[PDB]
Design an enzyme around this catalytic site. Structure first.
Site, PDB file in Angstrom:
ATOM      1  CG  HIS A   1       4.937  65.170 -51.017  1.00 23.19           C
ATOM      2  ND1 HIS A   1       3.773  65.086 -51.496  1.00 23.19           N
ATOM      3  CD2 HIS A   1       5.278  63.442 -52.083  1.00 23.19           C
ATOM      4  CE1 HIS A   1       2.987  64.856 -52.115  1.00 23.19           C
ATOM      5  NE2 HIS A   1       4.051  63.680 -53.054  1.00 23.19           N
TER       6      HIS A   1
ATOM      7  CG  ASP B   1       2.101  68.556 -50.391  1.00 21.38           C
ATOM      8  OD1 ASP B   1       3.230  68.856 -50.838  1.00 21.38           O
ATOM      9  OD2 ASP B   1       1.974  67.300 -50.444  1.00 21.38           O
TER      10      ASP B   1
ATOM     11  CD  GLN C   1       2.665  56.073 -52.577  1.00 23.18           C
ATOM     12  OE1 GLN C   1       1.529  54.947 -51.969  1.00 23.18           O
ATOM     13  NE2 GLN C   1       3.038  57.310 -51.637  1.00 23.18           N
ATOM     14  N   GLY C   2       3.207  57.431 -56.800  1.00 23.62           N
ATOM     15  CA  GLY C   2       2.695  57.784 -58.696  1.00 23.62           C
ATOM     16  C   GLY C   2       2.155  58.705 -58.892  1.00 23.62           C
ATOM     17  CG  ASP C   3      -2.231  58.187 -58.574  1.00 23.58           C
ATOM     18  OD1 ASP C   3      -2.062  57.926 -60.007  1.00 23.58           O
ATOM     19  OD2 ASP C   3      -2.678  57.228 -58.177  1.00 23.58           O
ATOM     20  CB  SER C   4       2.240  62.376 -55.270  1.00 23.96           C
ATOM     21  OG  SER C   4       2.042  61.780 -54.278  1.00 23.96           O
TER      22      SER C   4
END
Lengths: 230, 230
Positions: A40, A85, A182-185
């Site tokens: 993603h 993913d 969020q941002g860790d992905s």
């Protein structure tokens, strides 16, 4: 990263910052040329427009920046279920590794998993809390306990979501408060003991909510896919 | 503990809570009968006013409570300088060790020191920030960088205080934000790699202020002293 602490020099040397103009996702050094991240994160991005910062505890300063040459997203990536993913990035020029804040991490055995009672370390520059206004500038890290697949699957029914054999979970069911955000992905989830990347920060419902463990891509299920593609 | 994270099962199995009706100091399991702590925790206290809680990540719930039988405060403890800030406690009844959350940590070699570049882990139930007048219920740990004696001495050489040879320092001199705080006193400072307690949480000016690092008792200077008493 929620409920973590600032990483120290050399603690998470495999972490990279994936960037297009600025940081949006993390990634894990597998070797000189190859970064592992989430599908993603790279989905419908152009390789030419992405870069990485490595060798730095800060995402926007220091270490060195390299252009991405290639994006390989899993062919069975399902954007609706966030399953499969995983993605590989190939860089235009090599990273200088063995370098204190720049070092490769190992891959687990093909088909391995984590089990309840395993602890794993997750790192990156994501929000410190669900819905904060900015990214921290310094790398955070958190150790969380793995949650059984079956249990995690059952908790996520309340959100209408499946946790599959391609996913592992980790966090604190009873209390929340530890997690990726969020941002860790696309960031690493590491067995420190063995120095092995076992997970990728993938999805979850909010960040660090009670009853809602972070879901991570189960790297053991793509050992096949990684070694072929490299 | 400021700027840390909740210890997981098994991570800090050597932490005890030293209590007088309730927690007020930490301490470190050296073995079944012996707890290392700070002289400033036990000084002018009666042994059988004191108990420890072991084998819990919670100071007020869980594990087991054991009464103290003996207090050895260092015979050179200077309370004005907080120098020689080490005590030993012997328990009335042995601790069941080799559990998940109850093991002894080892001692460093005689006369050893920490250097710049080392990191140490500090744990306890102390305040999570300066002047927030409540103890976390769950054990915290933080990993800090060592700060050279010379530097630490100059930093304190301004609050009119002296960091002696019997003392080591940890903190972030640029940022602060990682430190021990009130209630963490006497808690262990560990070299995780070698599984050795090199420090005891001693003193500091405020908590996590930059340029006022936490000051720890330098356990390497009391190896003789400890091994004799036991």
């Amino acid at each position: 990263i929620v409920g973590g602490e600032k990483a120290l020099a050399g603690e998470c040397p495999y972490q990279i910052s994936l960037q297009s103009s600025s940081h949006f996702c993390g990634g894990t050094i597998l070797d000189e040329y190859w970064i592992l991240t989430a599908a993603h994160c790279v989905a419908g991005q152009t390789a030419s427009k992405l870069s990485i910062r490595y060798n730095s505890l800060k995402h926007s300063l220091g270490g060195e920046k390299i252009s991405v040459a290639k994006i390989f997203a899993h062919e069975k990536y399902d954007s609706f279920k966030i399953d499969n993913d995983i993605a590989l990035i190939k860089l235009k020029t090599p990273m200088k590794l063995d370098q204190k804040n720049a070092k490769a991490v190992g891959l687990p055995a093909k088909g391995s998993d984590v089990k309840v009672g395993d602890q794993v370390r997750v790192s990156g520059w994501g929000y410190l809390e669900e819905g904060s206004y900015s990214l921290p500038s310094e790398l955070r890290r958190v150790d969380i306990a793995v949650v059984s697949r079956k249990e995690c699957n059952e908790l996520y029914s309340k959100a209408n979501a499946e946790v599959t054999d391609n996913m592992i979970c980790g966090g604190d069911v009873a209390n929340g408060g530890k997690d990726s955000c969020q941002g860790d992905s696309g960031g690493p989830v590491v067995d420190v003991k063995n120095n092995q990347v076992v997970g990728i920060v993938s999805w979850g419902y909010g960040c660090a909510r009670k009853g809602y463990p972070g879901v991570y891509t189960r790297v053991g299920n793509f050992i096949d896919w990684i070694e072929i593609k490299t």
